[PDB]
Design a protein around this nucleic acid. Structure first.
Lengths: 75, 97, 95, 83, 109, 95, 109, 97, 83
DNA sequence: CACTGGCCGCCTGGAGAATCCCGGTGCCGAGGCCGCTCAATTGGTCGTAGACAGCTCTAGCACCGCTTAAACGCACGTACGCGCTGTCCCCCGCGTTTTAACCGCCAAGGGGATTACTCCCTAGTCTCCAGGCACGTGTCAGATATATACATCCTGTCATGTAAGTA
DNA sequence: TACTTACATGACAGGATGTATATATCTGACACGTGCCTGGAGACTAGGGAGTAATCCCCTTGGCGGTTAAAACGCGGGGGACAGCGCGTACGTGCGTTTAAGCGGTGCTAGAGCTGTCTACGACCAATTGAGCGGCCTCGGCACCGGGATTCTCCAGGCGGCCAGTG
């Protein structure tokens, strides 16, 4: 079981916190390096990132949809 | 609910149908009219054997199937499945026209 | 009555009977076979004429035909046709 | 008597069927007109030679004999009509 | 006191006409002289070619469980042999159709 | 002592001086012109040979080559060629 | 006694050898008979063809500030005339090179 | 810092130079050696006229320049500027080899 | 006298130069060996023709004129070599 | 904090439809027989094309010594293939309506096309000669080298727009 | 909420280098004179291919009615094209190094090539026939129709996973 996907996406985006937002490919590589089945959870992580960007805890940097770059909220 | 096949499945099934079959695929008499239309552009009052229209036809599906197979190869080369004007122009450019 | 128009009917039919005792042939495929043999005959004759010109030779010999077939036919078709023609010319020279 | 526009007689389903014989899955909308133009260009390339053969024979009737002969010259040689 | 008229095709043990092919070479104007063994050799070449292609057509028709050769059988026989295909890439057989050949990307998953 | 080897040097040189009084030639390009006229000769002559043979005609006429040049040369090359060829055969007829 | 020698090329007003073309047609095995005006016509078309190709070669040489024709000039002459290029599509000129031809997407910016 | 051009600009200058120039692009001696190796497979103890090796050299460069210009057409058809092997097999398979 | 690995004699920069004449800007590194293979195929075909011409003439010295004939039979006509 | 319904994705069986496959039936092409004629055959002859030996000479090959141009290779960089995703729209599938393709049926006539005739044209042969040419020579267009001028490409620098911290 | 400051961006000057450009020089490849001989031309003949006149009949063209399969059109919708954006790599480019191509010179000979001989070999041609083609007839292989089974496809339905709301 373990924690659900939202916490691990927040850990993936908060591990680096570059000046530009983190790309989705680097985030997939980071969560795979931490250890996670990204293969059957592409839809899961895409809906999760739409859920978290829509709820305002994280903000989209450049791209649209699941593509592009993701950076943290102001506070 | 009325029944409906998904796109491409009918397409592939009648790919198999027409590749299994051998007969003509252009309507005969409009092709005959088109041939006469080209003929009167060079010399007036031409007459045609029926077999002449047949032979122009067989050559026409020959050249068109060959060109279309080559454009299909050009299209799958460009990671697409739909043939485009650029595919026709490309195939004629390598083929030599 | 109409004048004789030449065809390759009987020869190709007899060859088909030898290679297959049972099967038949349609007439339109038969005309296709006639066109095939006429085309190949024309190709070999054209090569033989060109090599006759190139070596300034006035005579189409069996050597010239053999060279032309080796030119035109690919691989095992070439050497099998060479073998068949060699057997035939040895039979004919042995009368 | 005269013929002014019969290229639409090579209909869009006819181009579809030709694509289906060639193994084409899906065909763009703009394809049909330029394939009409291509089949056009091929036809006057053949028929110009064919009527050149015919007028050389002093005939006013096109034969399939001359048609396959024009294909023989043009390099798309056809079996099934010679002889 | 002439001898019996024997045939040169039988002299070569062949059925393709040695005399007729020799006639077509002489009147086909390829040289002013034609050697004796040349049309015999050519007829053997043509007969071998026709024999093997009708052999392939017969196996295609037997595979198609038809007892009679149709142009579809000839088209299949030409295009299924790569050496005959290279021999005859530039030709079209009337009413022959094409091989059933599908690119792997065209087929569904 | 040598054997005879033929080429088309003098004619290409004269027609070059006719179209350009001051323009020279290199020997390699001169051989290219030799081979060009040879190749066009074989093309036109061979297609004239088919037009003769296939209509059961045993003779190459000016009409035969007129048909052949109408065949091979595309567009205005054919028309200019048939025009100057017509003028040339007209002059040869008149002389 | 006998007529003074007059060449058939001068009779046709041509520079190309009518007699030599007639001789090569007879020994080229194209037909056993050749009409009299036939080599005249063939020499005329050959002379015309050489005229435009050598004219274009001279123009290209003048563009290159070159007095004499180089095979590069011939290659440039053929490939810049689409009528000649249609005539000589399957043709290689030795040491001719190619046209300066760069696709538009290859260029910078 | 020493000077250095961006990629392609040197390549474009090579394009302009070699399309301007007409002399051979492959070295003479290894090509002649390769031709002798290839002919060794068919017949032993062949000798070659120098002009024969030159004509084979012209055939080789002509065929390859044609192959790469059609390969370039195939590559720009696939929205690329880098040619890859599938371009060459596509060009050869359309051309008829 | 024996020749063992001569296909590598057509070096990488030679293929680069040939691509430059063809108008190619960027070339993959995987290209060169299959062009060596394709070039080998082209020469083995044309030299098979030319060698066949040579043994037909009862010669065993290859002449250029036969190479012109071989390219003629492949439909790859070459001027400039006494054709 | 833990339970539990709700949404999404995945797996699976079942219904329908295109197709495969099994029969019958009637039909017309294929195959086989007969008459015919014309093209292969026989035999001889005659002239000659090419095989065969021989002799020359030249160019292809082998070797070698320098001599750099090119090839090899490595390293640094950047730009290009390309994988993913998101979006938009465009063509496939299907039902309905139309329409002309096809069949099939009949009239007409025009042109292939065949035979006959008679004639211009062209190959052939002998004779004669002059044009194209191998060969020699000389000589200037162009290769080569050197020195300038500019194009162009890449980069550093300055003004501007925009994001961010703060009063 | 508006004000001031740091970073990204784009425009422009300028240097390095490659490439055009002017001019000297020498050189060998192009251009031209010469002996010549061999192929082109003149003249006349044999004869024959081929243009032309007349006919016919077969095939092509023209046209009319009916049916329906196919074309056309519209709706819907899902799947493909494709734009964009990041990534990671993989050639390009530029430096130095190796070596091996390239040039020049020398020697050999083997085979190309050219000349003479002749002899087998293939064309020419009258007589002959039998092998192959035109025509006709039949029937059974096969096209078409009809019915049952199968496979494929598409979707409805069931199960698991996760997530979010609430007691």
């Amino acid at each position: 079981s373990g924690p659900p996907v939202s916490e691990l996406i927040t850990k993936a985006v908060a591990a680096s916190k570059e000046r530009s937002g983190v790309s989705l490919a680097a985030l997939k590589k980071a969560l795979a390096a931490a250890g996670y089945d990204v293969e059957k959870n592409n839809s899961r992580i895409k809906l999760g990132l739409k859920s978290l960007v829509s709820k305002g805890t994280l903000v989209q940097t450049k791209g649209t949809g699941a593509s592009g770059s993701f950076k943290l909220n102001k506070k | 609910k009325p029944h409906r096949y998904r796109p491409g499945t009918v397409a592939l099934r009648e790919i198999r149908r027409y590749q299994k079959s051998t007969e003509l695929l252009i309507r005969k008499l409009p092709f005959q009219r088109l041939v006469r239309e080209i003929a009167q552009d060079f010399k007036t009052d031409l007459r045609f054997q029926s077999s002449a229209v047949m032979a122009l036809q067989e050559a026409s599906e020959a050249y068109l199937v060959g060109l279309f197979e080559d454009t299909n190869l050009a299209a799958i080369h460009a990671k697409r499945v739909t043939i485009m004007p650029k595919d026709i122009q490309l195939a004629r450019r390598i083929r030599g026209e | 009555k109409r004048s004789r128009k030449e065809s390759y009917s009987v020869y190709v039919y007899k060859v088909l009977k030898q290679v297959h005792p049972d099967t038949g042939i349609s007439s339109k495929a038969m005309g296709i076979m006639n066109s095939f043999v006429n085309d190949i005959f024309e190709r070999i004759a054209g090569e033989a004429s060109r090599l006759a010109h190139y070596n300034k030779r006035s005579t189409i010999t069996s050597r010239e035909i053999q060279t032309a077939v080796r030119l035109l036919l690919p691989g095992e078709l070439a050497k099998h046709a060479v073998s068949e023609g060699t057997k035939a010319v040895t039979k004919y020279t042995s009368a | 008597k005269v013929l002014r526009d019969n290229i639409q007689g090579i209909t869009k389903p006819a181009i579809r069927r030709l694509a289906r014989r060639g193994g084409v899955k899906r065909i763009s909308g703009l394809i049909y007109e330029e394939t009409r133009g291509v089949l056009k260009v091929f036809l006057e390339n053949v028929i110009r030679d064919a009527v050149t053969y015919t007028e050389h024979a002093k005939r006013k009737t096109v034969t399939a004999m001359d048609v396959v002969y024009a294909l023989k010259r043009q390099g798309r040689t056809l079996y099934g009509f010679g002889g | 006191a002439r001898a019996k008229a024997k045939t040169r095709s039988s002299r070569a043990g062949l059925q393709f006409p040695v005399g007729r092919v020799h006639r077509l070479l002489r009147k086909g104007n390829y040289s002013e002289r034609v050697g004796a063994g040349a049309p015999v050799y050519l007829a053997a070449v043509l007969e071998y070619l026709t024999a093997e292609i009708l052999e392939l057509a017969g196996n295609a028709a037997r595979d198609n469980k038809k007892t009679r050769i149709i142009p579809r059988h000839l088209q299949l026989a030409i295009r299924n042999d790569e050496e005959l295909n290279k021999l005859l890439g530039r030709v079209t057989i009337a009413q022959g159709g094409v091989l059933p050949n599908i690119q792997a990307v065209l087929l569904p998953k």
